[PDB]
Write a protein that binds this ligand. Structure first.
Ligand SMILES: CCCCCCCC/C=C\CCCCCCCC(=O)OC[C@H](O)CO
Ligand SMILES: CCCCCCCC/C=C\CCCCCCCC(=O)OC[C@H](O)CO
Ligand SMILES: *C\C=C(C)/C=C/C=C(C)/C=C/C1=C(C)CCCC1(C)C
Ligand SMILES: CCCCCCCC/C=C\CCCCCCCC(=O)O
Ligand SMILES: CCCCCCCC/C=C\CCCCCCCC(=O)O
Ligand SMILES: CCCCCCCC/C=C\CCCCCCCC(=O)O
Ligand SMILES: CCCCCCCC/C=C\CCCCCCCC(=O)O
Ligand SMILES: CCCCCCCC/C=C\CCCCCCCC(=O)O
Length: 264
């Protein structure tokens, strides 16, 4: 699975290799630091919204474990030899991120629907269509990147199919947001609209990283891709969760939850 990604094609300078290692290890710290924050403020969230901050804790740990796994895989697969880090064993691939996404994306979408105050039949219904659309996106994306070394054309076609799911997914999300933001309390009807645009921006970096093999097929393309993943993860998981948490607390406060009012 590692021979199919471009990381296996190149030697890396100390500077490139340590920059990638430092990017992944920093990602671990950030996520686990935000995990403590999400855990602490959960007591300031009304029971109605408390599951949202819990889902952020699930995302933080899910991401932190795969980023930590990826950093160690990175240092195991390569060895500094003759002035460059060269592939030693085949134990590093990007496929594990696509596993992180399969798991984190349903959680990220669920926390959004919860603060939108959807409930019951509509919650279960809307969540099912989003998670299926999203899994189709991720799965077709994972098939495509198996060809980023061998068959770029296939990468593209699987990229096109994956993007179809992405567009439909965002159309559902946007439609539910704009049709339900009047139900939101404390002025969060204004904040949720920004969350949506944060989503659009953060999530669009992933397909850009996905296409790096096609327009920068070299060792700096590998560094660049990890940098895009790092900006994307922090924005779609950390900042977004903070955005979701702030909305949860605000609506809790507007709903008469005392611990939420005292915290604010
Ligand atoms: C690709 C085809 C996808 C088309 C079929 C997906 C339909 C999604 C849907 O109908 O659900 C949206 C609705 O707003 C939630 O209740
Ligand atoms: C590569 C081939 C396939 C590529 C095709 C690309 C087409 C993209 C079209 C629109 C943007 C999609 C994003 C949709 C953003 C959410 C839509 C929305 O804002 O919802 C509207 C709602 O009806 C208001 O109440
Ligand atoms: C970690 C959180 C999230 C929301 C991950 C999001 C991933 C995507 C939006 C991926 C999209 C893809 C597209 C649209 C087509 C290329 C293949 C991808 C799966 C990378
Ligand atoms: C304060 C909240 C906790 C923050 C502390 C983070 C904990 C340790 C992170 C270190 C993980 C080790 C990764 C190194 C592996 C490598 O070098 O590739
Ligand atoms: C394809 C996988 C299955 C798809 C179904 C996804 C699961 C969604 C099911 C239930 C919605 C979760 C809501 C949890 C309760 C929170 C409600 C609340 O406290 O206000
Ligand atoms: C067990 C977790 C995975 C859940 C799968 C169910 C979700 C369905 C999502 C979209 C189906 C797309 C399947 C197309 C795969 C073709 C790739 C191939 O066969 O080589
Ligand atoms: C959703 C289900 C997937 C939809 C169609 C996927 C078509 C892509 C197949 C291209 C692979 C080329 C080949 O192996 O012959
Ligand atoms: C992930 C973004 C989704 C959109 C993908 C772009 C759609 C295809 C665009 C142009 C087709 C160009 C096909 C060139 C194939 C030859 C390249 C090669 O095989 O080496």
């Amino acid at each position: 699975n590692s021979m199919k990604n471009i990381e296996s094609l190149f030697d890396y300078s100390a500077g490139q290799f340590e920059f990638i290692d430092h990017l992944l290890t920093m990602g671990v710290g950030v996520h686990f630091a935000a995990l403590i924050f999400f855990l602490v403020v959960s007591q300031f969230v009304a029971p109605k919204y408390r599951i949202a901050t819990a889902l952020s804790c699930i995302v933080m740990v899910s991401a932190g474990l795969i980023l930590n796994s990826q950093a160690v895989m990175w240092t195991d697969a390569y060895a500094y030899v003759d002035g460059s880090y060269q592939l030693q064993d085949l134990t590093f691939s990007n496929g594990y991120r696509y596993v992180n996404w399969m798991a984190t994306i349903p959680c990220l979408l669920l926390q959004l629907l919860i603060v939108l105050n959807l409930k019951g039949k509509e919650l279960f219904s809307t969540a099912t269509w989003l998670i299926l659309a999203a899994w189709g996106m991720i799965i077709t994306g994972y098939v495509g990147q198996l060809y980023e070394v061998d068959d770029i054309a296939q990468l593209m076609i699987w990229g096109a199919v994956s993007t179809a799911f992405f567009v439909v997914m965002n159309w559902i999300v946007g439609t539910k947001i704009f049709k339900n933001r009047a139900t939101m309390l404390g002025g969060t009807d204004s904040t949720i609209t920004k969350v949506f645009w944060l989503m659009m921006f953060a999530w669009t970096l992933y397909p850009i990283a996905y296409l790096v093999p096609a327009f920068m097929n070299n060792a700096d393309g590998v560094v660049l891709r990890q940098l895009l993943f790092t900006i994307a993860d922090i924005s779609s998981k950390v900042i977004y969760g903070l955005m979701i948490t702030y909305i949860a607390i605000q609506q809790s406060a507007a709903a008469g939850y005392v611990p939420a009012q005292q915290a604010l």
